[PDB]
Every structure is written in C-alpha cells, then in structure tokens.
Structure 1
C-alpha cells in the first residue's frame, strides 16, 4: 500500500496539482532454506516460541526472527511451556538451555 515491501517511512513532497511520496521500505535481500519445527519437546514438556520461529542448521537448532536471520540459542526466556509433546504434530527432539 505504501511502496513495495515492509514499510519504514514516507516523505511527502508537493507538486503542481499533485503530491509525490518517497517511500523508504525494507526488502528481504537474500533467501536461505532452513528446517523448521513448531515446538521443542524437553523434559517431557512442550515448548513454544514466544517470538520468532525455530530454525535448524545441520543438526543444531535456534529460534530466530521471521524477517532476519539472527540465530539465538533456545532458552526458557525465549520459549514458553504449555501442553504435552504427544498432542502437538511435527515436534522434534532437542534440548532447552536455561540461564
């Protein structure tokens, strides 16, 4: 709606019988595949991400943002605890570090 991509700002400038908008926008530059999982089963408990999605590089797992690859180690601050491992579909086995 406001330019093309994720919107940062728009600067208006006048024009004779018109207005021109300079839209500063955010565009994802490069792409990369990752393996993903909905939740992590640790100590018999299901862990769901508070913010971000789970990605995997090789065998090891991180949680990261949807719009930028900033891998952070999974922590009890990063994920919240709810449910059980049985009812969730697609859960993988991993560990949850705690500070």
Structure 2
C-alpha cells in the first residue's frame, strides 16, 4: 500500500520572511504564496495557514539570507493584551 501524490500546482516560495528586522524560518513546512499573501503549509500536502510564532522560528537579522521577503507575523498574544 503506497502513497502517491497526483496533481500539482505551481506556487511562489521564499526561504525567509522578514518582520521586525529579524529573520523568521519555518519550523515545520514551507512558505507558499498565491500571488497576494504568504501562506504557511506543510511539504507533502497543501493546507494554508496564517503566519504564527508557533509555526515559525526566529534567528539572525534580515541582511544575511538571500531571497527574504517582508510580511507581517501574527501574534495571538497581541489581541489578548488589548482585550
């Protein structure tokens, strides 16, 4: 019993996402885009999610990694401090 993927679809990638001046790296999965917003899905399947601090890992600055892009990283603690 084997697991074979079938149909493919081409998306836009990036190694890192720059937010506050520090580079973010994916903990699990890859960075994809539909042409408007950057989505975080896993490697073997397409399940797009919002960019979170639990799914991403932060090290270094943004002047190192070639191909880094700028987007916002959603923090769930920030609406909890404002409510």
TM-score grouping bracket, smaller chain normalisation:
0.7 to 0.9
- Structure 1 CA distance for aligned equivalents of residues 18 and 39 of structure 2: 14
- Extract unaligned runs of 5+ from structure 2: 76-83
- Higher relative contact order, chain-length normalized (CA < 8 Å, sep 6+): 2
CA drift at 1:72 = 0.9
- Structure 1 CA distance for aligned equivalents of residues 4 and 56 of structure 2: 28
- Structure 2 CA distance for aligned equivalents of residues 79 and 26 of structure 1: 28
- Quote the residue 2:22 is aligned against: 45
Task: Report the structure number with the largest CA radius of gyration.
Answer: 1
Match for 2:53 among 49, 60, 76?
76
- Structure 1 CA distance for aligned equivalents of residues 25 and 38 of structure 2: 13
- Structure 2 CA distance for aligned equivalents of residues 28 and 58 of structure 1: 24
Aligned residues: 75
More strand by share: 1
CA drift at 1:63 = 1.0
Which consecutive segments of 4 or more residues in structure 1 shift more than 2 A? none
Calculate the TM-score normalised by the size of structure 2.
0.87
- Structure 1 CA distance for aligned equivalents of residues 3 and 72 of structure 2: 34
More helix by share: 2
SS of residue matched to 2:3: strand
RMSD over equivalenced CA pairs, Å: 0.7
SS of residue matched to 2:57: strand
